[PDB]
Amino acid sequence: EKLVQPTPLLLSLLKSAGAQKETFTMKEVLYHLGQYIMAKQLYDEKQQHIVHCSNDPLGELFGVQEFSVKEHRRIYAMISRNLVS
Numbered sequence: 652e653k654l655v656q657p658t659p660l661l662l663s664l665l666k667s668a669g670a671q672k673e674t675f676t677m678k679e680v681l682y683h684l685g686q687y688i689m690a691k692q693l694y695d696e697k698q699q700h701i702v703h704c705s706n707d708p709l710g711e712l713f714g715v716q717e718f719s720v721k722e723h724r725r726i727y728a729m730i731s732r733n734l735v736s
């Protein structure tokens with residue numbers, strides 16, 4: 652319901668994934684990040700539901716080599732740090 656404004660980096664990635672506006676609802680951010688991840692194929696079975704983003708700008712976005720898609724509080728947290736408002 653609330654609209655959030657992404658930082659330039661998170662923005663360039665969302666657009667690159669299909670987004671066509673510069674403010675979103677959290678659900679939209681997650682939706683597009685999902686597509687980005689599927690696109691650049693950073694998610695794998697095996698693993699343990701892990702996104703490997705060590706050579707990707709997403710890794711710089713979130714500041715990690717990888718993460719579990721299974722703990723939403725962390726993800727929302729890594730995302731909130733890239734929300735300008």
Ligand SMILES: COc1cc(C(N)=O)ccc1NC(=O)[C@@H]1N[C@@H](CC(C)(C)C)[C@@]2(C(=O)Nc3cc(Cl)sc32)[C@H]1c1cccc(Cl)c1F
Pocket residue numbers: 681682684685686688689694699700702720721722723724726727
């Ligand atoms: C197959 O997918 C899973 C499998 C398992 C499992 N243990 O079997 C757990 C979890 C998932 N997936 C997910 O939660 C949800 N699937 C992820 C997408 C993905 C392509 C990685 C499968 C997820 C999503 O939908 N957008 C998004 C953006 C991220 Cl950065 S991450 C993520 C997860 C997610 C959904 C809703 C809210 C949040 Cl905060 C969230 F992080």
